[PDB]
Amino acid sequence: GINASVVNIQKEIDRLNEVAKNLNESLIDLQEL
Amino acid sequence: GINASVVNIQKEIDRLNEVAKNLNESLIDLQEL
Amino acid sequence: DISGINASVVNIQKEIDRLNEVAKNLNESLIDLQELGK
Amino acid sequence: DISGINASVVNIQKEIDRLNEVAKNLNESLIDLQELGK
Ligand SMILES: [Cl-]
């Protein structure tokens, strides 16, 4: 119930953290240019 | 160069759009509860 | 506690709205970089 | 146009900051839902 949504939202927070991390890696690539 | 970062950022925008879409699906699951 | 579910729906909705605004801005930066790129 | 790369770095940095703030808020909503959940 609520637990199904807790699992699904946790997955999305994990996905969102990957977005931020990977954008940061691109920022370093660009900062260097 | 810039093209490598354009590809990598596009991938992250695609990932971010999945975050928003999937959170919205969980919101519907919760709104219904 | 049912007030609780409604509160979290409203809260998460606000975050989705902010994610959508981020995605719009990132798409704009992508265009900016393409203009440098080609 | 080099000003251009720097501008996009600053712009994307602002968006990463906003994503990090979203993630913090979503983590808080996750805790709220867990409190309903268990
Ligand atoms: Cl993924």
Swiss-Prot record, chains A, B:
Region entry Heptad repeat 2, spans: 1-32
List of glycosylated residues: N3, N24
Coiled-coil residue windows: 5-33
Function comment: Acts as a viral fusion peptide which is unmasked following S2 cleavage occurring upon virus endocytosis.
Protein name (database record): Spike protein S2'
UniProtKB/Swiss-Prot annotation, chains C, D:
Lineage top rank: taxon: Viruses
Glycosylation sites: N6, N27
Residues forming coiled coils: 8-36
Annotated segments matching region Heptad repeat 2: 1-35
Annotated function: Acts as a viral fusion peptide which is unmasked following S2 cleavage occurring upon virus endocytosis.
Protein's name in the database: Spike protein S2'
Source species of the chain: Severe acute respiratory syndrome coronavirus (SARS-CoV)
Gene: S
Full-length numbering of the shown residues: 1150 to 1187 of 1255
